[PDB]
Design a binder for these strands. Structure first.
Lengths: 226, 109, 142, 59
RNA sequence: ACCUCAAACAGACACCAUGGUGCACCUGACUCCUGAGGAGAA
RNA sequence: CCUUUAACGAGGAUCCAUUGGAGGGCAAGUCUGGUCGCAGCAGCCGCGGUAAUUCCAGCUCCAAUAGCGUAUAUUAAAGUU
């Protein structure tokens, strides 16, 4: 009948360079450690490999002189099976609105993972590079590397995240109250972050400090653009 | 009680009056002897045998059974010493039953 | 942390652990044997007795019910145990001054559910199960 | 009401109706019971939009 | 006188205990296409 | 006994697979009848006070399977020795 979308007019500088398609991958963005402030940038590069896995839909409620008032707080995971995962929390008066608020927030907070090998090479990394940890308020995880074909040996909660990450082999162990899973999953996600923030002898050679996209593509942005 | 509140959240009431089983087989009339605490209570049966009576669900805090007065008691199928309260009556109902000549004519109210 | 890590401190480790193990509840019952002496069982899974007389046992709040237990004296100790009877109408299939076979609830020392003072239940009346009496694939042998 | 004391056992089971509709149809065992379980769930192939249905629904 | 330094400072308490009981999870995210050629006409 | 071989030996009604469970933990009914804080269920949390997804039955469904349930000792879970 009537056709054509028009969606996503950027109000963000970084968003405009993507929309004009002078930034060709997310990998450039992460290398300059920029914020991402829009949820359509990620959904432009990807959007046909991102799945969601709604973990829990948890009530909370406070007390007032007229009685209870309940809001629903849901956690929603996100990730494609090539190395990018994310996670988000949001709460709202009702259910569906809170879920849809979290599916947006999880895309925003998406990060890459670094995968590595066991003790020898045959191509295609299958496991975690080094033995790392991640803590969120008395919960911690100890992601330990593992040989091929052992599968992910973990509890149900981190087994979601690590499987979406493409980390197919891992040994784990938990410590502390894992019953309150909001800590447990955020502590897993904390660990998965540290993989590119862990220094290894590979990375000891010095970087060349290539010029920023902000600098090079500034010529199009001298019109009125911000 | 003396009025108060929070006594209306819940099902007023009352006994719109009403009527009138018995006895049945192991299910007969007794009189309150004492008034223990905790919950249980004492009650001598009208036949001559004593027994110790026990309260029943619902009737818990929904009906007060002051000391002295007729009351309907089931007997336990196997137990002699302990017996189980049912269905109380009214003091008016008890004096009508006495006038009819169905319970023994021995106790005063 | 906060403790010795010597190379010749095997004695000070292995004598400390042997003492602080007794503060555990479980360990202290197993090895003193006060368990055996106090229990009406010898540690045996079941035991056998003879009925003394039926009883009615009141429930703990909120629940209100009458639970129709029995009371039993044992063959090999002569001491008394109060034992639950399972499903509806199975009380009738137990008759006074006969033998029965008892068994623990499944919590291994503690009173189960809303019924207090009972730590045992009943399984067989006289080489015949409560099941087959209840279901009707067997009959009373008398 | 409750009449003829409430201590009485056999109460609920001795006043219920007893009925049946015992099978004439023979059910499968061993191999074929798994064969039907495979086909009826996965190789039909019915599934549609997000739903809560379960493999039972007498609602 | 008037006239010439420049900071704040109301004060003591008789009594006053106790409330028959059975309340408040049954909580999830792909659907719109109603209509339009219609309606008159047909 | 086993293996080897005559002769008889399968139309599903019988040449018959059971043991537990279906509120959550934990795989499967906010179906129908009965009971109404009674009777009972419930390792635990809790179900029953006349509209019971948990009781007693029917139907359907789920798990394991020539096995399955229950009690008790004991190890793993316990970085709660």
């Amino acid at each position: 009948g009537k056709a054509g979308d028009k969606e996503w007019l950027p109000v963000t500088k970084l968003g405009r360079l993507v929309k004009d398609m002078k930034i060709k991958s997310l990998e450039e963005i992460y290398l300059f450690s920029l914020p991402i402030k829009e949820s359509e940038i990620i959904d432009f590069f990807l959007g046909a490999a991102l799945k969601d896995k709604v973990l829990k839909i948890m009530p909370v409620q406070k007390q007032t002189q007229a009685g209870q008032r309940t809001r629903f707080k849901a956690f929603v995971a996100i990730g494609d099976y090539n190395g990018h995962v994310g996670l988000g929390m949001k709460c709202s008066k009702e259910v569906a609105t809170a879920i849809r608020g979290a599916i947006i927030l999880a895309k925003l907070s998406i990060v890459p993972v670094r995968r590595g090998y066991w003790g020898n090479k045959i191509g295609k990394p299958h496991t975690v590079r080094c033995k790392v940890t991640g803590r969120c308020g008395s919960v911690l995880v100890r992601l330990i590397p593992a040989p091929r074909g052992t599968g992910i040996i973990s509890a149900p909660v981190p087994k979601k995240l690590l499987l979406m990450a493409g980390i197919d082999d891992c040994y784990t162990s938990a410590g502390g109250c894992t019953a309150t899973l909001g800590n447990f999953a955020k502590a897993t996600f904390d660990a998965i972050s540290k993989t590119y923030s862990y220094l290894t002898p590979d990375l000891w050679k010095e970087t060349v400090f290539t010029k920023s996209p902000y600098q090079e593509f500034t010529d199009h942005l001298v019109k009125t653009h911000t | 009680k003396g009025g108060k509140n929070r006594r209306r959240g819940k099902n007023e009431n009352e006994s719109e009056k009403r009527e009138l089983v018995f006895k049945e087989d192991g299910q007969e009339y007794a009189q309150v002897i004492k008034m223990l605490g905790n919950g249980r209570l004492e009650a001598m049966c009208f036949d001559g045998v004593k027994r110790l009576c026990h309260i029943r669900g619902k009737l818990r805090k929904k009906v007060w059974i002051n000391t002295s007065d007729i009351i309907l008691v089931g007997l336990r199928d196997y137990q002699d010493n302990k017996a189980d309260v049912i269905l109380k009556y009214n003091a008016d109902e008890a004096r009508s039953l006495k006038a009819y000549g169905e319970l023994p004519e021995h106790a005063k109210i | 942390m906060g403790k010795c890590r010597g190379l010749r401190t095997a004695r000070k480790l292995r004598s400390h652990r042997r003492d602080q193990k007794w503060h555990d509840k479980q360990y202290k019952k197993a090895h003193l044997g006060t368990a055996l002496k106090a229990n009406p069982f010898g540690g045996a899974s079941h035991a056998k007795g003879i009925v003394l007389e039926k009883v009615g046992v009141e429930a703990k709040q909120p629940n209100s019910a009458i639970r129709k237990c029995v009371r039993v004296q044992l063959i090999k100790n002569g001491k008394k145990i109060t034992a639950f009877v399972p499903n509806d109408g199975c009380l009738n299939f137990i008759e006074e001054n006969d033998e029965v076979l008892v068994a623990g609830f499944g919590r291994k020392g503690h009173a189960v559910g809303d019924i207090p003072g009972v730590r045992f239940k009943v399984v067989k009346v006289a080489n015949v199960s409560l099941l087959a009496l209840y279901k009707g694939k067997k009959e009373r042998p008398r | 009401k409750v009449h003829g004391s409430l201590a009485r056992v056999g109460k609920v089971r001795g006043q219920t109706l007893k009925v049946a509709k015992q099978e004439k149809k023979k059910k499968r065992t061993g191999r074929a019971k798994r064969r039907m379980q495979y086909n009826r769930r996965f190789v039909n192939v019915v599934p549609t939009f997000g739903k809560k249905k379960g493999p039972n629904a007498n609602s």
